[PDB]
Amino acid sequence: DMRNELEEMQRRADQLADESLESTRRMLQLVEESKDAGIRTLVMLDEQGEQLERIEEGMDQINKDMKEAEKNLTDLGK
């Protein structure tokens, strides 16, 4: 009558982490810095676009003025 039976106990392997808290924090800090740099680039790019738009009008005005002056001088000369 040496017929034995058993029961079982369970253990849980550690969840997936303990490497997600050293590279993670550095990743977040770098992401924040990149976000700030992107915001600054946004602002600078908008300012540059405004300045180019401003330049356009003066360019067109000088072109028109020179063309009209040349035509007038030619007309009077002949």
């Binding site: 005005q61 000088i62 003025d65």
Partner: protein, 68 residues
């Protein structure tokens, strides 16, 4: 077992490398954008001077030829 451990250990360094490359690119971007902005400011100053001189010269020559 060790498969997931190695997978987790191998899926973190690549993010760091990509992020650092992005950082360097963005920094270079900022410097060159500042330089381009300064250049464009000089451009605008030169254009303004040129147009003002055009107006002055055309007015002067027109009045001079009108009066003869």
């Amino acid at each position: 077992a060790l498969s997931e451990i190695e997978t987790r250990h191998s899926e973190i360094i690549k993010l760091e490398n990509s992020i650092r490359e992005l950082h360097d690119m963005f920094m270079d971007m900022a410097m060159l954008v500042e330089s381009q902005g300064e250049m464009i400011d000089r451009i605008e100053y030169n254009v303004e001077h040129a147009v003002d001189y055009v107006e002055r010269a055309v007015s002067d020559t027109k009045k001079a030829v009108k009066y003869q």
